[PDB]
Design a protein around this ligand. Structure first.
Ligand SMILES: *C/C=C(C)/C=C/C=C1/N(C)c2ccccc2C1(C)C
Length: 137
């Protein structure tokens, strides 16, 4: 199925805690979890090729990738990483990340589409999991 769309957040669980495991200091966390930082996600999918733009009121970030091909992005806390996405199933992709420099928590993300059209974004840092759920506007 098709991940394309303009997605708006309807659920967010455990995001502040993910930030703590990543070592984001408290001043930045308050900003990051504020409504001004609420994410909107735009996806354009063509087969295995994806464009994903994630924007807030003050920030915008775009990734471009094809499933199975390595690309560069940033960890949630903004460290450059090499990422690789694979299909876990027909409706679910999983991305492993490796830091370009230094050491840190093991991080990953997954995106999956439910039959009822919800987009579930899961982010992990070691033993902590954050889940965000979106629907199409
Ligand atoms: C991933 C979530 C981020 C970056 C921010 C979300 C913040 C909020 N806030 C402050 C809020 C208040 C009411 C309902 C929903 C939210 C949301 C989780 C968007």
């Amino acid at each position: 199925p098709n991940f394309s769309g303009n997605w708006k957040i309807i659920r967010s669980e455990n995001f502040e805690e993910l930030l703590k495991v990543l070592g984001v200091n408290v001043m930045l966390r308050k900003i990051a979890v504020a409504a001004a930082s609420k994410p909107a996600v735009e996806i354009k999918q063509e087969g295995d090729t994806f464009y994903i733009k994630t924007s807030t009121t003050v920030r915008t970030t775009e990734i471009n990738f094809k499933v199975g091909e390595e690309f560069e992005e940033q960890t949630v806390d903004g460290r450059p990483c090499k990422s690789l996405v694979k299909w876990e199933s027909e409706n679910k992709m999983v991305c492993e990340q490796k830091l370009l420099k230094g050491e840190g928590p093991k991080t990953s993300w997954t995106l999956e589409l439910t039959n009822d059209g919800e987009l579930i974004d899961t982010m992990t840092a070691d033993d902590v999991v954050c889940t965000k759920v979106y629907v199409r506007e």
